[PDB]
Amino acid sequence: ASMLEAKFEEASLFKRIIDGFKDCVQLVNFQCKEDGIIAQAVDDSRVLLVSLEIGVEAFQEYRCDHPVTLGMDLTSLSKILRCGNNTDTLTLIADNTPDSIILLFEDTKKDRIAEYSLKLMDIDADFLKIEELQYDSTLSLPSSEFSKIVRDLSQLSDSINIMITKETIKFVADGDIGSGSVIIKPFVDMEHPETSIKLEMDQPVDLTFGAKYLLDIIKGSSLSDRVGIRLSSEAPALFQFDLKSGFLQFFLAPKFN
Protein backbone atom coordinates (compact mmCIF):
# COMPACT_ATOMS: atom_id res chain seq x y z
CA ALA A 1 0.00 0.00 0.00
CA SER A 2 2.66 2.48 -1.11
CA MET A 3 2.19 3.71 -4.70
CA LEU A 4 -1.49 4.68 -4.82
CA GLU A 5 -3.41 5.43 -1.60
CA ALA A 6 -6.72 7.22 -2.24
CA LYS A 7 -9.53 7.70 0.28
CA PHE A 8 -13.05 8.76 -0.66
CA GLU A 9 -14.62 11.08 1.89
CA GLU A 10 -17.85 9.12 1.38
CA ALA A 11 -17.91 5.64 -0.14
CA SER A 12 -21.26 6.32 -1.84
CA LEU A 13 -19.59 8.75 -4.26
CA PHE A 14 -17.57 6.02 -5.97
CA LYS A 15 -20.61 3.74 -6.20
CA ARG A 16 -22.72 6.46 -7.82
CA ILE A 17 -19.94 7.45 -10.23
CA ILE A 18 -19.41 3.84 -11.31
CA ASP A 19 -23.14 3.19 -11.68
CA GLY A 20 -23.42 6.31 -13.83
CA PHE A 21 -21.53 4.65 -16.71
CA LYS A 22 -21.84 0.98 -15.71
CA ASP A 23 -24.34 0.08 -18.45
CA CYS A 24 -22.56 2.14 -21.15
CA VAL A 25 -19.24 0.26 -21.29
CA GLN A 26 -17.93 -3.13 -20.13
CA LEU A 27 -14.22 -2.63 -19.40
CA VAL A 28 -12.47 0.56 -18.28
CA ASN A 29 -8.95 2.00 -18.01
CA PHE A 30 -8.44 4.04 -14.83
CA GLN A 31 -5.14 5.89 -15.26
CA CYS A 32 -4.12 7.28 -11.87
CA LYS A 33 -1.62 10.12 -12.30
CA GLU A 34 -0.21 12.38 -9.60
CA ASP A 35 -2.95 14.96 -10.31
CA GLY A 36 -6.02 12.71 -10.13
CA ILE A 37 -7.74 9.87 -11.97
CA ILE A 38 -8.70 9.84 -15.66
CA ALA A 39 -10.64 7.03 -17.36
CA GLN A 40 -11.56 6.41 -20.99
CA ALA A 41 -13.85 3.62 -22.16
CA VAL A 42 -15.40 2.66 -25.50
CA ASP A 43 -18.52 0.51 -25.62
CA ASP A 44 -18.78 -2.69 -27.64
CA SER A 45 -20.67 -0.85 -30.40
CA ARG A 46 -17.54 1.32 -30.85
CA VAL A 47 -19.81 4.36 -31.21
CA LEU A 48 -20.07 5.84 -27.67
CA LEU A 49 -16.95 7.01 -25.83
CA VAL A 50 -16.88 7.82 -22.11
CA SER A 51 -14.36 10.09 -20.40
CA LEU A 52 -14.18 10.50 -16.63
CA GLU A 53 -12.04 12.79 -14.48
CA ILE A 54 -11.78 12.84 -10.68
CA GLY A 55 -9.59 15.51 -9.09
CA VAL A 56 -7.81 15.76 -5.76
CA GLU A 57 -10.51 18.06 -4.38
CA ALA A 58 -13.12 15.28 -4.26
CA PHE A 59 -10.54 13.12 -2.46
CA GLN A 60 -10.10 13.47 1.29
CA GLU A 61 -6.57 12.02 1.08
CA TYR A 62 -4.80 11.14 -2.19
CA ARG A 63 -1.17 10.03 -2.56
CA CYS A 64 0.14 8.76 -5.90
CA ASP A 65 3.85 8.94 -6.72
CA HIS A 66 4.14 7.24 -10.12
CA PRO A 67 1.39 7.01 -12.78
CA VAL A 68 -0.35 3.63 -12.89
CA THR A 69 -2.91 2.32 -15.39
CA LEU A 70 -5.49 -0.09 -13.95
CA GLY A 71 -7.65 -2.16 -16.29
CA MET A 72 -10.95 -3.06 -14.65
CA ASP A 73 -14.14 -4.94 -15.47
CA LEU A 74 -17.08 -2.83 -14.35
CA THR A 75 -19.25 -5.84 -13.48
CA SER A 76 -16.79 -7.17 -10.90
CA LEU A 77 -16.14 -3.65 -9.61
CA SER A 78 -19.88 -3.16 -9.11
CA LYS A 79 -20.09 -6.52 -7.35
CA ILE A 80 -17.35 -5.61 -4.86
CA LEU A 81 -18.70 -2.08 -4.36
CA ARG A 82 -22.19 -3.42 -3.59
CA CYS A 83 -20.55 -5.57 -0.89
CA GLY A 84 -19.67 -2.39 1.04
CA ASN A 85 -21.66 0.06 3.12
CA ASN A 86 -22.93 3.46 1.98
CA THR A 87 -22.01 5.06 5.32
CA ASP A 88 -18.41 3.92 5.12
CA THR A 89 -14.94 5.07 4.09
CA LEU A 90 -13.70 3.54 0.83
CA THR A 91 -9.95 3.42 0.15
CA LEU A 92 -8.31 2.47 -3.14
CA ILE A 93 -4.86 0.89 -2.78
CA ALA A 94 -2.48 0.00 -5.61
CA ASP A 95 1.09 -1.27 -5.27
CA ASN A 96 4.12 -1.82 -7.50
CA THR A 97 3.07 -3.11 -10.94
CA PRO A 98 -0.45 -3.85 -9.65
CA ASP A 99 -1.90 -7.09 -10.94
CA SER A 100 -4.85 -6.31 -8.65
CA ILE A 101 -6.27 -3.41 -6.66
CA ILE A 102 -7.41 -3.38 -3.03
CA LEU A 103 -10.70 -1.77 -2.00
CA LEU A 104 -10.82 -1.17 1.76
CA PHE A 105 -14.18 -0.50 3.44
CA GLU A 106 -13.39 1.00 6.85
CA ASP A 107 -15.69 2.67 9.39
CA THR A 108 -15.03 4.58 12.61
CA LYS A 109 -18.32 3.97 14.45
CA LYS A 110 -17.47 0.25 14.45
CA ASP A 111 -14.12 -1.50 13.99
CA ARG A 112 -15.20 -3.69 11.06
CA ILE A 113 -12.72 -3.56 8.15
CA ALA A 114 -13.44 -5.30 4.83
CA GLU A 115 -10.47 -5.64 2.47
CA TYR A 116 -11.55 -6.80 -0.99
CA SER A 117 -9.14 -7.48 -3.86
CA LEU A 118 -10.07 -7.10 -7.53
CA LYS A 119 -7.91 -8.67 -10.23
CA LEU A 120 -6.99 -6.26 -13.01
CA MET A 121 -7.55 -7.06 -16.68
CA ASP A 122 -4.89 -6.52 -19.35
CA ILE A 123 -6.72 -3.91 -21.42
CA ASP A 124 -5.03 -3.31 -24.79
CA ALA A 125 -6.68 -0.03 -25.78
CA ASP A 126 -4.67 3.09 -26.55
CA PHE A 127 -5.86 6.34 -25.00
CA LEU A 128 -7.79 8.23 -27.69
CA LYS A 129 -6.49 11.77 -27.24
CA ILE A 130 -9.63 13.87 -26.77
CA GLU A 131 -8.55 16.98 -28.63
CA GLU A 132 -10.50 20.08 -27.63
CA LEU A 133 -13.26 20.77 -30.17
CA GLN A 134 -14.96 24.16 -30.54
CA TYR A 135 -18.51 22.91 -31.01
CA ASP A 136 -20.73 25.18 -33.09
CA SER A 137 -23.59 25.21 -30.56
CA THR A 138 -23.63 24.98 -26.76
CA LEU A 139 -26.87 24.11 -24.94
CA SER A 140 -27.16 23.90 -21.15
CA LEU A 141 -30.49 22.88 -19.64
CA PRO A 142 -31.47 21.20 -16.35
CA SER A 143 -30.94 17.45 -16.21
CA SER A 144 -34.58 16.96 -15.22
CA GLU A 145 -35.90 18.48 -18.45
CA PHE A 146 -33.37 16.58 -20.58
CA SER A 147 -34.34 13.30 -18.93
CA LYS A 148 -38.05 14.05 -19.30
CA ILE A 149 -37.74 14.90 -23.00
CA VAL A 150 -35.57 11.91 -23.88
CA ARG A 151 -37.71 9.48 -21.87
CA ASP A 152 -40.88 10.79 -23.53
CA LEU A 153 -39.26 10.43 -26.96
CA SER A 154 -37.89 6.95 -26.18
CA GLN A 155 -41.27 5.26 -26.69
CA LEU A 156 -41.64 7.07 -30.04
CA SER A 157 -38.58 6.24 -32.16
CA ASP A 158 -35.26 4.43 -31.97
CA SER A 159 -33.54 7.48 -33.53
CA ILE A 160 -33.90 11.12 -32.44
CA ASN A 161 -32.89 14.14 -34.52
CA ILE A 162 -31.70 17.24 -32.65
CA MET A 163 -31.63 20.62 -34.40
CA ILE A 164 -30.23 23.77 -32.78
CA THR A 165 -30.93 27.27 -34.10
CA LYS A 166 -31.87 30.73 -32.85
CA GLU A 167 -33.13 30.34 -29.26
CA THR A 168 -34.60 27.07 -30.50
CA ILE A 169 -33.92 23.40 -29.75
CA LYS A 170 -35.97 20.72 -31.52
CA PHE A 171 -36.01 17.01 -30.67
CA VAL A 172 -37.86 14.92 -33.29
CA ALA A 173 -38.56 11.19 -32.96
CA ASP A 174 -40.15 9.43 -35.95
CA GLY A 175 -40.72 5.75 -35.19
CA ASP A 176 -43.37 3.06 -35.55
CA ILE A 177 -46.04 4.84 -33.44
CA GLY A 178 -45.82 8.20 -35.24
CA SER A 179 -43.69 11.34 -35.24
CA GLY A 180 -43.34 13.49 -32.12
CA SER A 181 -41.50 16.80 -31.81
CA VAL A 182 -40.49 18.70 -28.67
CA ILE A 183 -39.44 22.35 -28.95
CA ILE A 184 -37.58 24.25 -26.22
CA LYS A 185 -36.23 27.78 -25.99
CA PRO A 186 -33.82 29.51 -23.59
CA PHE A 187 -35.13 31.21 -20.47
CA VAL A 188 -33.62 32.91 -17.42
CA ASP A 189 -35.60 32.82 -14.17
CA MET A 190 -34.22 34.32 -10.96
CA GLU A 191 -36.59 32.12 -8.93
CA HIS A 192 -34.94 28.93 -10.26
CA PRO A 193 -31.64 29.88 -11.94
CA GLU A 194 -30.50 26.26 -11.73
CA THR A 195 -33.32 25.35 -14.14
CA SER A 196 -32.54 28.18 -16.57
CA ILE A 197 -32.01 27.09 -20.18
CA LYS A 198 -29.06 28.73 -21.97
CA LEU A 199 -28.25 28.52 -25.68
CA GLU A 200 -25.13 29.82 -27.45
CA MET A 201 -25.32 29.25 -31.22
CA ASP A 202 -23.14 30.65 -34.00
CA GLN A 203 -24.40 28.47 -36.88
CA PRO A 204 -27.54 26.29 -36.62
CA VAL A 205 -26.86 22.56 -36.90
CA ASP A 206 -28.82 19.32 -37.19
CA LEU A 207 -27.66 15.84 -36.16
CA THR A 208 -29.42 12.50 -35.72
CA PHE A 209 -28.49 10.16 -32.85
CA GLY A 210 -29.66 6.78 -31.63
CA ALA A 211 -32.34 6.61 -28.96
CA LYS A 212 -30.78 3.72 -27.02
CA TYR A 213 -27.42 5.48 -26.66
CA LEU A 214 -29.10 8.67 -25.45
CA LEU A 215 -31.12 6.67 -22.92
CA ASP A 216 -28.00 4.92 -21.62
CA ILE A 217 -26.28 8.32 -21.46
CA ILE A 218 -29.03 9.94 -19.39
CA LYS A 219 -29.15 6.90 -17.08
CA GLY A 220 -26.27 8.57 -15.21
CA SER A 221 -28.01 11.95 -14.90
CA SER A 222 -28.50 11.56 -11.14
CA LEU A 223 -24.82 12.38 -10.61
CA SER A 224 -25.10 15.94 -11.99
CA ASP A 225 -27.84 18.58 -12.13
CA ARG A 226 -27.59 20.03 -15.67
CA VAL A 227 -26.49 18.97 -19.15
CA GLY A 228 -23.68 20.51 -21.18
CA ILE A 229 -24.63 19.48 -24.70
CA ARG A 230 -22.18 20.62 -27.38
CA LEU A 231 -22.93 20.09 -31.07
CA SER A 232 -20.71 20.55 -34.12
CA SER A 233 -20.89 19.85 -37.86
CA GLU A 234 -19.82 16.19 -37.96
CA ALA A 235 -18.63 15.51 -34.41
CA PRO A 236 -20.07 13.42 -31.56
CA ALA A 237 -22.26 15.31 -29.12
CA LEU A 238 -20.46 16.03 -25.84
CA PHE A 239 -22.99 15.18 -23.14
CA GLN A 240 -21.01 16.54 -20.19
CA PHE A 241 -22.21 16.02 -16.60
CA ASP A 242 -20.11 17.94 -14.07
CA LEU A 243 -19.47 16.49 -10.60
CA LYS A 244 -17.86 17.92 -7.47
CA SER A 245 -14.23 17.75 -8.66
CA GLY A 246 -13.89 16.59 -12.27
CA PHE A 247 -16.52 15.52 -14.78
CA LEU A 248 -18.13 12.65 -16.70
CA GLN A 249 -18.40 13.19 -20.45
CA PHE A 250 -20.11 11.16 -23.16
CA PHE A 251 -19.10 11.52 -26.81
CA LEU A 252 -22.13 10.08 -28.58
CA ALA A 253 -21.27 9.86 -32.27
CA PRO A 254 -23.92 11.01 -34.78
CA LYS A 255 -25.86 9.07 -37.38
CA PHE A 256 -24.80 9.03 -41.02
CA ASN A 257 -25.99 12.02 -43.04
Binding site: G71, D73, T97, D99, K119, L120, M121, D122, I123
Partner: protein, 318 residues
Protein backbone atom coordinates in the same frame (compact mmCIF):
# COMPACT_ATOMS: atom_id res chain seq x y z
CA UNK B 1 -8.93 -48.90 10.80
CA UNK B 2 -10.42 -45.69 9.38
CA UNK B 3 -7.25 -44.02 8.01
CA UNK B 4 -6.43 -45.18 4.48
CA UNK B 5 -3.00 -44.96 2.86
CA UNK B 6 -2.50 -43.37 -0.53
CA UNK B 7 -2.45 -45.89 -3.41
CA UNK B 8 0.80 -46.26 -5.32
CA UNK B 9 -0.80 -44.90 -8.50
CA UNK B 10 -1.09 -41.59 -6.61
CA UNK B 11 1.77 -41.94 -4.11
CA UNK B 12 4.16 -42.62 -7.02
CA UNK B 13 2.64 -40.30 -9.61
CA UNK B 14 5.55 -38.73 -11.53
CA UNK B 15 6.08 -35.15 -10.38
CA UNK B 16 8.76 -34.35 -12.99
CA UNK B 17 8.84 -34.86 -16.75
CA UNK B 18 11.94 -37.08 -16.40
CA UNK B 19 10.02 -39.65 -14.31
CA UNK B 20 7.47 -40.37 -17.06
CA UNK B 21 8.34 -43.58 -18.91
CA UNK B 22 7.37 -44.14 -22.53
CA UNK B 23 7.00 -41.84 -25.53
CA UNK B 24 10.62 -40.74 -25.27
CA UNK B 25 10.41 -38.21 -28.12
CA UNK B 26 7.33 -36.41 -26.78
CA UNK B 27 8.56 -36.38 -23.18
CA UNK B 28 11.96 -35.02 -24.22
CA UNK B 29 10.26 -32.36 -26.35
CA UNK B 30 8.04 -31.34 -23.44
CA UNK B 31 11.13 -31.13 -21.22
CA UNK B 32 12.81 -28.89 -23.79
CA UNK B 33 9.71 -26.68 -23.92
CA UNK B 34 9.67 -26.48 -20.12
CA UNK B 35 13.35 -25.45 -20.07
CA UNK B 36 12.93 -22.92 -22.92
CA UNK B 37 9.33 -21.67 -22.86
CA UNK B 38 7.03 -20.43 -25.61
CA UNK B 39 4.66 -23.29 -24.93
CA UNK B 40 2.34 -23.81 -27.93
CA UNK B 41 -1.31 -24.77 -27.84
CA UNK B 42 -1.33 -28.57 -27.72
CA UNK B 43 -3.70 -31.53 -27.90
CA UNK B 44 -2.46 -34.76 -26.31
CA UNK B 45 -4.25 -37.91 -27.49
CA UNK B 46 -3.89 -41.54 -26.50
CA UNK B 47 -5.35 -44.55 -24.75
CA UNK B 48 -6.14 -44.58 -21.01
CA UNK B 49 -3.39 -45.01 -18.45
CA UNK B 50 -0.38 -43.69 -20.39
CA UNK B 51 0.43 -40.38 -18.65
CA UNK B 52 -1.28 -37.59 -20.58
CA UNK B 53 -2.67 -35.75 -17.55
CA UNK B 54 0.53 -36.45 -15.61
CA UNK B 55 2.65 -35.01 -18.42
CA UNK B 56 0.43 -31.92 -18.74
CA UNK B 57 0.52 -31.25 -14.99
CA UNK B 58 4.28 -31.79 -14.77
CA UNK B 59 4.88 -29.43 -17.70
CA UNK B 60 2.64 -26.74 -16.21
CA UNK B 61 4.31 -27.04 -12.80
CA UNK B 62 7.87 -26.96 -14.12
CA UNK B 63 7.01 -24.02 -16.40
CA UNK B 64 5.28 -21.84 -13.79
CA UNK B 65 6.41 -22.79 -10.28
CA UNK B 66 5.28 -20.38 -7.57
CA UNK B 67 2.92 -18.83 -10.14
CA UNK B 68 1.15 -22.17 -10.66
CA UNK B 69 -1.71 -21.15 -8.36
CA UNK B 70 -2.55 -17.94 -10.25
CA UNK B 71 -1.46 -18.95 -13.77
CA UNK B 72 -3.24 -22.29 -14.24
CA UNK B 73 -6.95 -22.78 -14.91
CA UNK B 74 -7.80 -26.49 -14.82
CA UNK B 75 -11.28 -27.52 -15.99
CA UNK B 76 -12.43 -31.12 -16.41
CA UNK B 77 -15.60 -33.11 -17.06
CA UNK B 78 -16.48 -32.84 -13.36
CA UNK B 79 -16.71 -29.05 -13.79
CA UNK B 80 -19.30 -27.24 -15.89
CA UNK B 81 -17.78 -26.23 -19.24
CA UNK B 82 -20.77 -24.95 -21.18
CA UNK B 83 -20.93 -22.08 -23.63
CA UNK B 84 -21.41 -19.53 -20.84
CA UNK B 85 -18.40 -20.88 -18.93
CA UNK B 86 -16.20 -20.68 -22.03
CA UNK B 87 -17.43 -17.20 -22.93
CA UNK B 88 -17.07 -15.72 -19.41
CA UNK B 89 -14.64 -17.56 -17.12
CA UNK B 90 -12.04 -18.58 -19.71
CA UNK B 91 -12.22 -15.15 -21.35
CA UNK B 92 -11.72 -13.43 -17.99
CA UNK B 93 -8.77 -15.69 -17.16
CA UNK B 94 -7.18 -14.96 -20.55
CA UNK B 95 -7.73 -11.22 -20.11
CA UNK B 96 -6.53 -11.31 -16.49
CA UNK B 97 -3.21 -9.54 -15.94
CA UNK B 98 -0.43 -11.59 -14.33
CA UNK B 99 3.29 -10.74 -14.26
CA UNK B 100 5.15 -13.96 -15.07
CA UNK B 101 8.84 -14.70 -15.72
CA UNK B 102 10.20 -13.55 -19.09
CA UNK B 103 9.31 -16.71 -21.04
CA UNK B 104 6.22 -18.03 -19.24
CA UNK B 105 2.51 -17.70 -19.99
CA UNK B 106 -0.80 -18.54 -18.37
CA UNK B 107 -2.09 -22.08 -18.94
CA UNK B 108 -5.63 -23.38 -19.42
CA UNK B 109 -5.86 -27.17 -19.02
CA UNK B 110 -9.10 -28.58 -20.43
CA UNK B 111 -8.87 -32.19 -19.28
CA UNK B 112 -11.13 -34.71 -21.01
CA UNK B 113 -11.87 -32.16 -23.73
CA UNK B 114 -13.58 -34.84 -25.85
CA UNK B 115 -16.69 -34.43 -23.66
CA UNK B 116 -17.28 -30.80 -24.70
CA UNK B 117 -20.13 -29.64 -26.91
CA UNK B 118 -19.35 -28.36 -30.40
CA UNK B 119 -20.68 -24.92 -29.45
CA UNK B 120 -18.23 -24.57 -26.57
CA UNK B 121 -15.34 -25.65 -28.80
CA UNK B 122 -16.39 -23.14 -31.46
CA UNK B 123 -16.52 -20.41 -28.81
CA UNK B 124 -13.00 -21.57 -27.84
CA UNK B 125 -11.50 -20.58 -31.20
CA UNK B 126 -10.80 -16.84 -31.16
CA UNK B 127 -9.91 -16.70 -27.46
CA UNK B 128 -6.81 -18.76 -28.30
CA UNK B 129 -5.77 -16.35 -31.10
CA UNK B 130 -6.39 -12.91 -29.58
CA UNK B 131 -4.81 -13.89 -26.23
CA UNK B 132 -1.94 -16.11 -27.38
CA UNK B 133 0.54 -13.58 -25.98
CA UNK B 134 -0.60 -14.22 -22.38
CA UNK B 135 -2.33 -17.62 -22.24
CA UNK B 136 -1.80 -21.03 -23.84
CA UNK B 137 -4.17 -23.99 -24.10
CA UNK B 138 -3.45 -27.66 -23.40
CA UNK B 139 -6.06 -30.33 -24.12
CA UNK B 140 -5.95 -33.98 -23.02
CA UNK B 141 -8.29 -36.36 -24.83
CA UNK B 142 -8.76 -40.06 -25.51
CA UNK B 143 -10.58 -39.72 -28.85
CA UNK B 144 -8.95 -37.03 -31.00
CA UNK B 145 -11.80 -36.98 -33.55
CA UNK B 146 -14.23 -35.35 -31.08
CA UNK B 147 -12.32 -32.04 -31.21
CA UNK B 148 -13.49 -29.83 -34.07
CA UNK B 149 -10.96 -29.40 -36.88
CA UNK B 150 -10.73 -25.59 -36.43
CA UNK B 151 -9.35 -26.13 -32.92
CA UNK B 152 -7.08 -28.98 -34.01
CA UNK B 153 -5.55 -26.60 -36.56
CA UNK B 154 -4.70 -24.21 -33.70
CA UNK B 155 -2.76 -26.74 -31.59
CA UNK B 156 0.22 -29.07 -31.85
CA UNK B 157 -0.76 -32.74 -32.05
CA UNK B 158 0.90 -35.08 -29.53
CA UNK B 159 -0.36 -38.63 -30.16
CA UNK B 160 0.93 -40.71 -27.27
CA UNK B 161 1.55 -44.35 -28.15
CA UNK B 162 0.80 -47.56 -26.29
CA UNK B 163 3.37 -48.29 -23.59
CA UNK B 164 5.69 -51.22 -24.23
CA UNK B 165 6.63 -54.04 -21.87
CA UNK B 166 10.04 -52.53 -21.12
CA UNK B 167 8.63 -49.24 -19.81
CA UNK B 168 6.07 -50.96 -17.58
CA UNK B 169 8.73 -53.32 -16.25
CA UNK B 170 11.08 -50.40 -15.54
CA UNK B 171 8.47 -48.41 -13.62
CA UNK B 172 7.20 -51.47 -11.74
CA UNK B 173 10.74 -52.41 -10.71
CA UNK B 174 11.39 -48.85 -9.55
CA UNK B 175 8.24 -48.93 -7.42
CA UNK B 176 9.20 -52.36 -6.07
CA UNK B 177 12.61 -51.02 -5.05
CA UNK B 178 11.01 -48.00 -3.39
CA UNK B 179 8.63 -50.32 -1.49
CA UNK B 180 10.87 -53.39 -0.97
CA UNK B 181 8.50 -55.88 -2.61
CA UNK B 182 9.37 -59.58 -2.84
CA UNK B 183 8.68 -60.72 -6.39
CA UNK B 184 9.36 -63.36 -9.02
CA UNK B 185 10.13 -62.51 -12.64
CA UNK B 186 7.17 -64.65 -13.67
CA UNK B 187 4.96 -62.51 -11.45
CA UNK B 188 6.12 -59.32 -13.15
CA UNK B 189 5.60 -60.93 -16.56
CA UNK B 190 2.04 -61.89 -15.59
CA UNK B 191 1.37 -58.39 -14.24
CA UNK B 192 2.60 -56.83 -17.49
CA UNK B 193 0.57 -59.28 -19.58
CA UNK B 194 -2.64 -58.56 -17.66
CA UNK B 195 -2.00 -54.80 -17.59
CA UNK B 196 -2.18 -54.62 -21.41
CA UNK B 197 0.04 -51.54 -21.40
CA UNK B 198 -2.01 -49.60 -18.83
CA UNK B 199 0.39 -48.40 -16.13
CA UNK B 200 -2.46 -47.62 -13.73
CA UNK B 201 -3.79 -51.17 -14.02
CA UNK B 202 -0.29 -52.63 -13.64
CA UNK B 203 0.40 -50.66 -10.46
CA UNK B 204 -3.04 -51.43 -9.02
CA UNK B 205 -2.63 -55.16 -9.71
CA UNK B 206 0.85 -55.17 -8.17
CA UNK B 207 -0.40 -53.37 -5.05
CA UNK B 208 -3.34 -55.75 -4.69
CA UNK B 209 -1.10 -58.80 -5.12
CA UNK B 210 1.39 -57.59 -2.51
CA UNK B 211 -1.31 -56.53 -0.04
CA UNK B 212 -3.29 -59.76 -0.44
CA UNK B 213 -0.71 -62.55 -0.53
CA UNK B 214 2.78 -61.01 -0.46
CA UNK B 215 5.13 -62.58 -3.00
CA UNK B 216 4.45 -61.37 -6.54
CA UNK B 217 4.61 -64.57 -8.60
CA UNK B 218 2.59 -65.96 -11.49
CA UNK B 219 0.27 -67.96 -9.22
CA UNK B 220 -0.51 -65.08 -6.85
CA UNK B 221 -0.78 -62.56 -9.70
CA UNK B 222 -3.23 -64.73 -11.64
CA UNK B 223 -5.23 -65.64 -8.53
CA UNK B 224 -6.59 -62.09 -8.26
CA UNK B 225 -6.20 -60.93 -11.86
CA UNK B 226 -7.86 -62.98 -14.59
CA UNK B 227 -6.53 -63.19 -18.13
CA UNK B 228 -8.12 -60.68 -20.54
CA UNK B 229 -11.37 -62.18 -21.77
CA UNK B 230 -10.90 -60.68 -25.28
CA UNK B 231 -7.97 -63.07 -25.81
CA UNK B 232 -10.12 -65.97 -24.60
CA UNK B 233 -12.83 -64.97 -27.08
CA UNK B 234 -10.23 -64.73 -29.85
CA UNK B 235 -9.01 -68.24 -29.00
CA UNK B 236 -12.59 -69.55 -28.96
CA UNK B 237 -13.34 -68.00 -32.36
CA UNK B 238 -10.10 -69.31 -33.93
CA UNK B 239 -10.51 -72.96 -32.89
CA UNK B 240 -10.52 -75.69 -35.52
CA UNK B 241 -13.08 -78.12 -34.09
CA UNK B 242 -16.46 -76.95 -32.83
CA UNK B 243 -15.92 -79.15 -29.77
CA UNK B 244 -12.87 -77.12 -28.70
CA UNK B 245 -14.64 -73.80 -29.28
CA UNK B 246 -17.66 -74.95 -27.27
CA UNK B 247 -15.35 -76.17 -24.49
CA UNK B 248 -13.64 -72.77 -24.39
CA UNK B 249 -17.00 -70.98 -24.31
CA UNK B 250 -18.19 -73.30 -21.52
CA UNK B 251 -15.35 -73.82 -19.05
CA UNK B 252 -13.66 -70.42 -19.56
CA UNK B 253 -16.51 -67.94 -20.19
CA UNK B 254 -19.96 -69.21 -19.17
CA UNK B 255 -19.02 -70.67 -15.78
CA UNK B 256 -16.70 -67.76 -14.89
CA UNK B 257 -19.63 -65.34 -14.55
CA UNK B 258 -19.31 -63.55 -17.90
CA UNK B 259 -22.66 -62.40 -19.27
CA UNK B 260 -23.86 -63.39 -22.73
CA UNK B 261 -24.07 -59.75 -23.85
CA UNK B 262 -20.43 -59.22 -22.88
CA UNK B 263 -19.39 -62.39 -24.71
CA UNK B 264 -21.17 -61.43 -27.93
CA UNK B 265 -19.88 -57.85 -27.88
CA UNK B 266 -16.32 -59.05 -27.28
CA UNK B 267 -16.70 -61.57 -30.11
CA UNK B 268 -17.91 -58.80 -32.42
CA UNK B 269 -14.93 -56.61 -31.54
CA UNK B 270 -12.40 -59.44 -31.89
CA UNK B 271 -13.79 -60.52 -35.26
CA UNK B 272 -13.68 -56.87 -36.32
CA UNK B 273 -9.95 -56.91 -35.43
CA UNK B 274 -9.21 -60.47 -36.64
CA UNK B 275 -6.64 -59.66 -39.31
CA UNK B 276 -5.74 -63.34 -39.73
CA UNK B 277 -9.11 -64.24 -41.28
CA UNK B 278 -10.14 -62.88 -44.67
CA UNK B 279 -12.41 -59.85 -44.89
CA UNK B 280 -15.35 -61.73 -46.40
CA UNK B 281 -15.34 -64.50 -43.79
CA UNK B 282 -15.03 -61.84 -41.10
CA UNK B 283 -18.09 -60.09 -42.53
CA UNK B 284 -20.18 -63.28 -42.49
CA UNK B 285 -19.05 -64.01 -38.93
CA UNK B 286 -20.04 -60.45 -38.01
CA UNK B 287 -23.47 -61.04 -39.56
CA UNK B 288 -23.97 -64.19 -37.49
CA UNK B 289 -22.72 -62.48 -34.32
CA UNK B 290 -25.09 -59.59 -34.97
CA UNK B 291 -28.00 -61.99 -35.35
CA UNK B 292 -27.04 -63.58 -32.03
CA UNK B 293 -26.69 -60.15 -30.40
CA UNK B 294 -30.14 -59.11 -31.62
CA UNK B 295 -31.58 -62.36 -30.26
CA UNK B 296 -29.92 -61.76 -26.88
CA UNK B 297 -31.03 -58.12 -26.66
CA UNK B 298 -34.66 -59.29 -26.86
CA UNK B 299 -34.28 -61.31 -23.64
CA UNK B 300 -33.42 -64.71 -25.18
CA UNK B 301 -29.93 -65.02 -23.77
CA UNK B 302 -28.72 -68.56 -23.12
CA UNK B 303 -25.72 -70.81 -23.67
CA UNK B 304 -27.68 -72.48 -26.48
CA UNK B 305 -27.68 -69.27 -28.54
CA UNK B 306 -23.92 -68.87 -28.13
CA UNK B 307 -23.38 -72.52 -29.08
CA UNK B 308 -25.48 -72.03 -32.21
CA UNK B 309 -23.49 -68.90 -33.06
CA UNK B 310 -20.24 -70.84 -32.69
CA UNK B 311 -21.60 -73.65 -34.86
CA UNK B 312 -22.57 -71.18 -37.59
CA UNK B 313 -19.15 -69.52 -37.38
CA UNK B 314 -17.48 -72.92 -37.74
CA UNK B 315 -19.67 -73.76 -40.74
CA UNK B 316 -18.62 -70.44 -42.29
CA UNK B 317 -14.93 -71.14 -41.58
CA UNK B 318 -15.10 -74.71 -42.93
Amino acid sequence: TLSLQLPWVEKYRPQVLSDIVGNKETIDRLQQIAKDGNMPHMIISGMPGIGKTTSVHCLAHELLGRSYADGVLELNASDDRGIDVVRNQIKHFAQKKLHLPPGKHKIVILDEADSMTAGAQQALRRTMELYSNSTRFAFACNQSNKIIEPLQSRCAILRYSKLSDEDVLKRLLQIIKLEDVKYTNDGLEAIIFTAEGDMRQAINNLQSTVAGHGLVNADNVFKIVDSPHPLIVKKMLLASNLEDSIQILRTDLWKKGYSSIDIVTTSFRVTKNLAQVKESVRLEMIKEIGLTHMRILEGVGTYLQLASMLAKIHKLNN
